[PDB]
Amino acid sequence: MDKATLVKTIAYRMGNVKGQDTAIDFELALSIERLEGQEFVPWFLLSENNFFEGTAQENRIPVPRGFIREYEEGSLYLRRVAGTGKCLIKKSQDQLLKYEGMTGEPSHYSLTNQYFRIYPVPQEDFKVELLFYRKSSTLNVEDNPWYEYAAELLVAETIWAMLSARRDKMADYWKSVAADQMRRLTILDAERRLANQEIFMG
Amino acid sequence: MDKATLVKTIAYRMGNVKGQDTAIDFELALSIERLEGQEFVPWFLLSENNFFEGTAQENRIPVPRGFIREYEEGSLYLRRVAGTGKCLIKKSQDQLLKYEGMTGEPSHYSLTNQYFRIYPVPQEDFKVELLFYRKSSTLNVEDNPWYEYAAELLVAETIWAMLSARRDKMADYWKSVAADQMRRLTILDAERRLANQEIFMG
């Protein structure tokens, strides 16, 4: 889908409307963000590994631009001068108060709100790399993946919006349509992660 | 079928259509795409064997084009120049970080987001074997498989979409028809996957 077949589809399914093309656009954009704010997250939004450079004597670390959440299976990693590193561990701030006023490599990471924190204070310059889900806009990818993936969800949900502003009954028919698609999407996501892994009880 | 009988069937079923064949074509294609995006994968979407070669010191391998999900009782295979081969294992990134810096034969991988990563990193170029599920728009066989098998789903869904666009009641009826057909095909998939297998514990 090419961001143009979407508006054509919206006109066609809405009833062959003609002169709302600006409106259509405003709305489709309003929509992708809303869905992004949603609590569920699809699978195409994990960023390429991004790293941050940290200056010494500072514990708090700014959150990446437009961050949403960390990766369930990926963690902050520090890369030393030799090229190797270690995986840092996270804990609630309270449990991490003990290492206050201590010396060494970093060891623990905590969320706070906008700032990560390193309580084992790195006395020198340091860097870590992360794997995090990020807002669609921020990602470099030449084009919006939402356009490619589940374009139907997108079509449906925007149609609902204008229709809600049009106080017409079928707003719901579309809403419901979005839902089926949304559920299915979660199934695809869950179906894909475990596709070829073998588990053992140890 | 031959893509003509399908169109004339669509025209006849929904009320003896004459001229909407252009909208028929546009909206029909859309159907095949929508269904593909959905959580289900019918058997005749399965791609043929694939291979790829990656250069030295490059542990990142991009996703094959048109990929959706790998084949479950299939797995990534490493082919060596001597004709000998092996099958690499799958684990989450976290489990597999440890090997960071172990040289030799590749052994493991992770799905990650869009790129394959092998932590046992060879120092030379190397070839890989892969199997997966691909969209019909991206398979190398001459004809689109979907028309041949499961035409009805395709007949119904485009009609459901075509009829729902004009705000007509029978939309629920046609959607129910499509749902029944999808459940039928889902049953038929398992009819073939486990057609005549024989099993015993160990």
Added chain:
Amino acid sequence: MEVTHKQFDLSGFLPDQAPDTLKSGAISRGFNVKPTILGWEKSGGFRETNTAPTNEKDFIFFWSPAIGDNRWFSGGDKTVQQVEGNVVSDVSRTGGYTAAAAARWNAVNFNGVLLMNNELDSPQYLAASGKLEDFPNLPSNVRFRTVAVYKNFILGLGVNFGSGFLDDEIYWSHQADPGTMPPNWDYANAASDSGRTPLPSEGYCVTSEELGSMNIVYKSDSIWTMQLIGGQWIFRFENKFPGQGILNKKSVVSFEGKHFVVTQKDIIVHDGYQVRSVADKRVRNFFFTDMNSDYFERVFVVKDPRVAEVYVFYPSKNSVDGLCDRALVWNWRDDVWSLLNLRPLKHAAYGYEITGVSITWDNFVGGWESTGLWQADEDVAKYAPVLHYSFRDVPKLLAPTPQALFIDEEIEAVWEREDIVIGSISRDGVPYQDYERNKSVSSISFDVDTTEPFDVYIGYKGSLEDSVEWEFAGTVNPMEDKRLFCLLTAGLFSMRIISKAQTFILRSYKITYEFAGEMWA
């Protein structure tokens, strides 16, 4: 969610009303399609008749000196002609008739003698000599505008001899002898019965004093009556309606039992004692405001005795020759109106034509076998006063014909309802349209008795404040299919129907739709 509408409640050509509130079957804009009892009909097609003037045809007229005879006169500059047998011309007055007269003569009927009068020439009558000649004792100095007839009283006219062309009338006749004007005419002398009367009024009495069994009445700009019951000086000058004035000479009142009157202001019907406009709220505005005629005269009206219709030929603004090219049609039997579009035309009249091959026959044989008395032909149509139209751009005349084809080319037809009463249908069978709810089309199906196809155009409009915009849809042959599919949504709903067909029979139609929102703009 569907509305079926029909076209046999017999509404007229109704452009002046608020077009959206028009009832079912009402026409917004018409193109020469006839509304009838069964439904919309095509009233067109023309046979080629046998008459041929071989000269300029300004005024044409039908008369007969005896039963079985058919004669016609074609008048022009310097010239009046004959149409009989196979020879024409050579009936005009001795000299060149008068200085380039054009569309300014007049014709009247009195007993069997045919009478013609012109503005620029003295009146000449036709006699056994075959040459039009002036009246016997009428002095030569005279020059006349218009002439009229009445009971045994020729020349009920209103213009004097000269230097006094303004406001006149003279009882030129006496108790006349049927077939010849009175042996004398003297008005001032008291030999018998004649005189001159002023009939004071602001306006100029223009033309004939019209008709009516009991008496004849007409107007300068207010209606006047004449009744000859008295004996001292016969006739009694009297008036009836001050208000009504008439605009054109050929804007004549009909010969029907009721009088069909066209005025500067309105179109009124009466018979002397009670008056009423024929169509005040329906037709009045469009007839006048279609164009400022701006050539007031040359607007003439005739009758169609066969079918209860009357045609008022009127110029189109688009027309520049001053020719009407268009005609207003109203049914007198039932109050329904219709409008036509035609080729440029100069004048029209009704009559009959009986022509066939005659003197070139094969057997020179003796008189004991039957000629058959000039057997065969429109013997049926001899009772039928079929109309004859002096089309501007043809040497031979034509007559109407049921098959809608001009000669070999075909005449167009267009049917337009700008907006339809579509929406909620209430307790009553008839629906009422809701403006607030915007709506989407589903399909169209038409009830037609013919078999020939007709094309269909679809119009859309944003709001009532907005104008109308057009779209075309391919035609469908009714034989195999009755429905067409299209998808669209607008403020109000417009369909435009055009047909190039032998016959068009519209009965009813149904529209399927759905309420899917409300009004935006």
Added chain:
Amino acid sequence: EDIVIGSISRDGVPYQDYERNKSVSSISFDVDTTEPFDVYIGYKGSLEDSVEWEFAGTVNPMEDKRLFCLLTAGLFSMRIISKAQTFILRSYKITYEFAGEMWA
């Protein structure tokens, strides 16, 4: 040639729907005489189409009042012919069902 047959509204008199194509069920005639009369049945595709004819065997009213036939067309036509001493027609009833819509 055609009968007003279809939806019957609030008023006792019915109104015919052209859009809905319909199937015959049966015919019964009210007659005071005793002599038989023959009956012919006509069918037509669309109103735009012409009329076409079919014949049905007569029935003597003494023993029977009904005849059975099966057919479906656009509009409904019956043709009645009688070679009889006396013919007394009173009324008739037609049974039917809405089973589709207009095609051609």
Added chain:
Amino acid sequence: MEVTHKQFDLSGFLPDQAPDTLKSGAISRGFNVKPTILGWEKSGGFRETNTAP
């Protein structure tokens, strides 16, 4: 799903109207059958009279 129609509202021989919209009992094409108060009647039959020219 049934319609009963009657022929005593006394409509005339009516071929000129739009034949489909004809009311109950109206006749499309007739053959010398007489419409009467009770219903359709036969108006025919002839005795042989005694005159001879």
